[PDB]
Design a protein around this ligand. Structure first.
Ligand SMILES: [Cl-]
Ligand SMILES: [Cl-]
Ligand SMILES: [Cl-]
Ligand SMILES: [Cl-]
Ligand SMILES: [Cl-]
Ligand SMILES: [Cl-]
Ligand code: NA
Ligand code: NA
Ligand code: NA
Ligand code: NA
Ligand SMILES: [Zn+2]
Ligand SMILES: [Zn+2]
Ligand SMILES: [Zn+2]
Ligand SMILES: [Zn+2]
Lengths: 56, 56
């Protein structure tokens, strides 16, 4: 299914959408993106919208 | 305005949307994302949809 990441970082404000087999796979991918971007924030997940938020 | 990046990398297939004052500013931001993700691809731009694509 489609999963989304809302980036709410100091220098990264955006929305990323990907496809993944499950939420765990999406979250692993999203955490790698955030790590590569130097985003070090607090994570939340909304199951109803399959949307993660990372907030610095 | 809103600008989009279609990631068509070997390991990064996704869509990123951001806001930016102009296409040049969006593209600079997008190129930094792609650099941070280790995406080394060919860039194209569609003015009508304010959408870049990076293709490995
Ligand atoms: Cl699907
Ligand atoms: Cl961003
Ligand atoms: Cl973690
Ligand atoms: Cl705007
Ligand atoms: Cl991606
Ligand atoms: Cl360049
Ligand atoms: Na996957
Ligand atoms: Na879920
Ligand atoms: Na900007
Ligand atoms: Na344009
Ligand atoms: Zn799927
Ligand atoms: Zn960004
Ligand atoms: Zn704008
Ligand atoms: Zn990716």
């Amino acid at each position: 299914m489609t999963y989304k990441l809302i980036l709410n970082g100091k220098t990264h404000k955006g929305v990323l959408t990907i496809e993944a087999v499950d939420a765990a796979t999406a979250e692993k991918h999203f955490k790698q993106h955030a790590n590569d971007l130097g985003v070090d924030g607090e994570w939340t997940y909304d199951d109803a919208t399959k949307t993660f938020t990372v907030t610095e």
